[PDB]
Design a protein around this nucleic acid. Structure first.
Length: 98
RNA sequence: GGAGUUAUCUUUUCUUCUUAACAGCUUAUCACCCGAAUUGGUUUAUCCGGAAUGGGGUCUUAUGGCUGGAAGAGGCCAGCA
């Protein structure tokens, strides 16, 4: 499974949140278990979500496509840089590594 | 405030007067509102704002207007020696 297939399942039973400030919260306190980082996410602010994730030792999914492919997988128009997955729910993203 | 026209006739008809550096007061655009849940802006709007979120949160520039200088000075037009 690719994570964009499983993102539609996070919407229902699980919880996600989008944003730089939203992911900054979630890596510092550690409410996110798995973040997603896209391709064309801005210069400084992308690197910090890699940093804080390695620091707290929260997991990072490095994405295949760009911000448009990531944004359509959740559901807004804008160039979604990150998706912070708090709870999985219906998503089979846990049992990818078994 | 001043004058009803040489010719029939005219006092709410025409004309003249009707003003003033600076400092203080304090507005459109931009960006840590990047970020972005939401949606003010004819609107296509990812955008940015009423409204809501962080970390602990807010800000610059600036047509005009308001206020001070001006206790004082000019000026339609007249009164005396």
């Amino acid at each position: 499974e690719s994570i964009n297939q499983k993102l539609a399942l996070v919407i229902k039973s699980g919880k996600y949140t989008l944003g730089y400030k939203s992911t900054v919260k979630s890596l510092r306190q550690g409410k996110s278990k798995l973040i997603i980082i896209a391709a064309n996410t801005p210069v400084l602010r992308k690197s910090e979500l890699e940093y804080y994730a390695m620091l707290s030792k929260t997991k990072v999914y490095y994405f295949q496509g760009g911000n448009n492919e990531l944004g359509t997988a959740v559901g807004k128009l804008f160039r979604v840089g990150v998706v912070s997955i708090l709870e999985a729910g219906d998503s089979d993203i846990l049992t990818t590594l078994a």
